[model samples]
Target: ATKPCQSDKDCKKFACRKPKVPKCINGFCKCVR
Candidate 1:
């Protein structure tokens, strides 16, 4: 996940995942149900 963002905090979610993207990006996740 080489997604780029404004900053580490921004990328924290888009690129980071968990307590970052889901919170920052406002509920976005890869799920298989």
Candidate 2:
């Protein structure tokens, strides 16, 4: 499941492992590689 977000800053609150960072894309928070 993806988290709701308005900006990249919002994704900062989410936890992601190394090589996979948090980012807000298309209004949602995703763990991108």
Candidate 3:
């Protein structure tokens, strides 16, 4: 299974951010590596 991820679908910064999780059971944006 693949639960950890990093997406810039609208966040507009893909290759610079971390703390990967494109989707979560109870979560949203603004995190780090």
Best by TM-score: 2
The TM-scores, one per candidate, come to: 0.16, 0.46, 0.22
Clashing pairs in 3: none
1 or 3, greater by TM-score: 3
Instruction: Give candidate 3's whole-model lDDT.
Output: 0.38
Clashing pairs in 1: 13-21
**lDDT per residue as tens, model 1, 1-33:** 543334434444334433433222233342111
In order of lDDT, best first, we have 2, 3, 1
Error (Å) of candidate 1 at residue 14 is 14
Instruction: Give stretches of model 1 more than 4 Å off.
Output: 11-33
Q: Is candidate 1 or 2 superior in lDDT?
A: 2
Model 3 misplaced stretches (Cα beyond 4 Å):
1-7, 14-25
TM-score: model 3 vs. ground truth: 0.22
Return the candidate ranking by TM-score, descending: 2, 3, 1
lDDT of 3 by residue, 1-33 (tens): 323333335344533345553332333333344
Clash count in backbone of candidate 3: 0
Residue 17 error for model 3, in Å? 8.4
Which ranges in model 2 have alpha carbons more than 4 Å from their true place? 6-12
Least accurate stretch of 10 residues (summed lDDT) in model 3? Answer: 21-30
